[PDB]
Amino acid sequence: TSMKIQFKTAMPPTEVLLESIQSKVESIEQLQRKLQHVQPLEQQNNEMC
Amino acid sequence: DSYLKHQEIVLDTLLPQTVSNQWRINNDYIRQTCTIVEEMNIQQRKQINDLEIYRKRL
């Protein structure tokens, strides 16, 4: 009864979140990927400096 | 997410600071190379004069 009630409440709270959060997760994770290229360009420039 | 944009901008400014300084080290080196060019070229011209003159005198 709990796995019926809570997980259907979980899947509703997840999918209402994932319609809103996975858009801003891609806003978060692709901006995290900008940091790993800004760091890799920083080291080769500091090596060349 | 707003915190991540502020962190990301700080990295880009460090990229311009290193880029400005590495250009400046190259810019100082470029003026020295051109001056070292003319000193070597004048030395070569004086040498080619001396090699020709010494055969002409003899």
Q: Is A49 in contact with B5 (Cβ distance < 8 A)?
A: no
Q: Enumerate the H helices of chain B as residue ranges.
A: 2-57
Rounded-to-integer distance, Cα A27 and Cα A38, Å: 17
Which experimental method was this entry solved with?
A: cryo-EM
Cα–Cα nearest to A42, from B13, B25, B3? B13
Sign of CA dihedral A27, A31, A33, A34: positive
Cα–Cα nearest to A34, from B30, B54, B6? B6
Resolution (A): 3.6
Rounded-to-integer distance, Cα B49 and Cα B56, Å: 11
Orientation angle between helical segments A2-48 and B2-57, nearest 10 degrees: 20
Residues making up chain A, counted from first to last = 49
Residue window 20-49, chain A: list those with CB within 8 Å of chain B.
24, 27-28, 31-32, 34-35, 38-39, 41-42, 45-46, 48-49
As given in the structure block, the two tokens for residue B57 are 């005198």
Distance between alpha carbon A21 and the CA centroid of its chain, in Å?
8
Q: Enumerate the H helices of chain A as residue ranges.
A: 2-48
Cα–Cα nearest to A41, from B2, B3, B29, B22? B22
Give the residue on B whose Cα is nearest the Cα of A37: B11
Choose, out of A23, A30, A38, A47, the residue to mutate when testing the contact with B (most B CBs < 10 Å).
Answer: A38
Rounded-to-integer distance, Cα B5 and Cα A28, Å: 9
Rounded-to-integer distance, Cα B14 and Cα A49, Å: 12
